[PDB]
Amino acid sequence: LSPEDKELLEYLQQTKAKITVVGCGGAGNNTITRLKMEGIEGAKTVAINTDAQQLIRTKADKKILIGKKLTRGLGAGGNPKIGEEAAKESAEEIKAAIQDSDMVFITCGLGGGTGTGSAPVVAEISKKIGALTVAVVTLPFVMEGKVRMKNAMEGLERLKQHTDTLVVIPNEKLFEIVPNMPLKLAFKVADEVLINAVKGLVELITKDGLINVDFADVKAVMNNGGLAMIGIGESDSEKRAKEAVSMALNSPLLDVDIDGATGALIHVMGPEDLTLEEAREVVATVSSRLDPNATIIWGATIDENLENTVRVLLVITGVQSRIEFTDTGLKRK
Ligand SMILES: Nc1nc2c(ncn2[C@@H]2O[C@H](COP(=O)(O)OP(=O)(O)OP(=O)(O)O)[C@@H](O)[C@H]2O)c(=O)[nH]1
Numbered sequence: 001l002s003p004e005d006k007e008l009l010e011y012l013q014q015t016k017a018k019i020t021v022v023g024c025g026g027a028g029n030n031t032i033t034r035l036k037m038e039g040i041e042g043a044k045t046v047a048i049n050t051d052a053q054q055l056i057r058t059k060a061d062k063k064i065l066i067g068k069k070l071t072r073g074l075g076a077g078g079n080p081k082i083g084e085e086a087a088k089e090s091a092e093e094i095k096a097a098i099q100d101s102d103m104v105f106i107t108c109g110l111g112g113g114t115g116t117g118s119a120p121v122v123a124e125i126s127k128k129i130g131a132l133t134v135a136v137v138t139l140p141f142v143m144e145g146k147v148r149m150k151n152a153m154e155g156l157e158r159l160k161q162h163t164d165t166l167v168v169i170p171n172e173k174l175f176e177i178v179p180n181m182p183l184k185l186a187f188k189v190a191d192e193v194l195i196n197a198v199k200g201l202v203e204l205i206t207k208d209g210l211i212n213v214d215f216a217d218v219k220a221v222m223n224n225g226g227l228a229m230i231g232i233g234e235s236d237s238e239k240r241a242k243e244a245v246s247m248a249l250n251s252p253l254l255d256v257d258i259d260g261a262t263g264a265l266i267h268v269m270g271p272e273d274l275t276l277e278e279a280r281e282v283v284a285t286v287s288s289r290l291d292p293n294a295t296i297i298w299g300a301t302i303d304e305n306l307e308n309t310v311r312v313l314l315v316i317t318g319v320q321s322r323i324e325f326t327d328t329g330l331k332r333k
């Protein structure tokens with residue numbers, strides 16, 4: 001290289017796109033494990049919990065047992081305050097774990113004591129170190145009781161204070177996707193949605209695809225994405241790309257008016273025969289449903305575990321004005 005170049009390269013050296021995914025509580029830890037085992041691209045995984053037993057059986061690049069002096073390696077028993085105090089107690093360790101991150105993904109299942117309580121603390125620390133802070137969390141099933149939904153919503157309120165974009169997935173809507181779903185499989189299905197949402201969002205930024213997704217653009221949109229929701233769809237039919245995005249746009253997980261949506265992140269995933277043309281048809285379809293001033297970031301990657309099905313992950317941001325926070329869950333305005 002040359003004097004100018006060599007300098008630049010060195011510059012690229014220091015700077016980067018350090019992404020860290022943090023899972024809190026059992027649900028959060030279970031998510032991290034899958035990401036680690038199936039190997040999420042260009043992202044560090046961190047699992048944190050008060051329950052040492054859940055944490056020891058968890059797999060991640062780093063593990064932080066929080067609340068040692070407070071919970072003595074035991075869970076929070078559903079007490080959000082314990083999870084908060086515990087996270088506060090381990091603020092330094094958490095900070096060390098996510099230090100130097102350009103972006104931090106906080107994932108957990110709201111409703112318990114650790115995830116609900118610690119998540120907002122990890123988020124605050126994440127912002128203090130200057131990382132684009134994004135959370136992907138789930139709301140509990142109705143069958144879990146009002147108390148769980150209350151703590152969840154309360155935690156969703158605290159969380160919204162420290163995040164740049166807060167993606168919320170209502171588990172209850174999972175029953176609308178698969179009506180005859182056996183109870184013993186509810187959480188196995190939720191696991192799948194969570195993984196597809198987090199991995200899908202992360203790899204959209206880190207995985208080489210048929211088109212380049214710029215990190216600066218991703219910042220611009222997530223920096224103030226506010227409250228966000230997702231849509232998932234896949235098809236192998238004649239118009240696979242057309243059906244997939246149609247499914248995603250009609251997904252019950254995306255329970256809200258998207259016309260006022262400020263932006264969107266679209267991740268098209270398919271087998272080796274995936275073409276840029278299909279990707280564009282997906283974007284075009286979504287583009288018409290949102291405000292013409294909305295910013296749309298999109299990518300398209302090959303997933304060899306797809307055979308001949310195309311998958312579409314939709315993330316609609318800035319929809320908090322079309323939503324209201326009740327202790328029974330989110331309600332459409
Ligand atoms: N996807 C997924 N969701 C889960 C699973 N188990 C729990 N949930 C959901 O996640 C919510 C929080 O539960 P946990 O993650 O177990 O709780 P925790 O954060 O560890 O908190 P404490 O046990 O009270 O210390 C529950 O209300 C369920 O909605 C699981 O294995 N997978």
Ligand SMILES: [Mg+2]
Nearest residue numbers: 026051075076
């Ligand atoms: Mg626990």
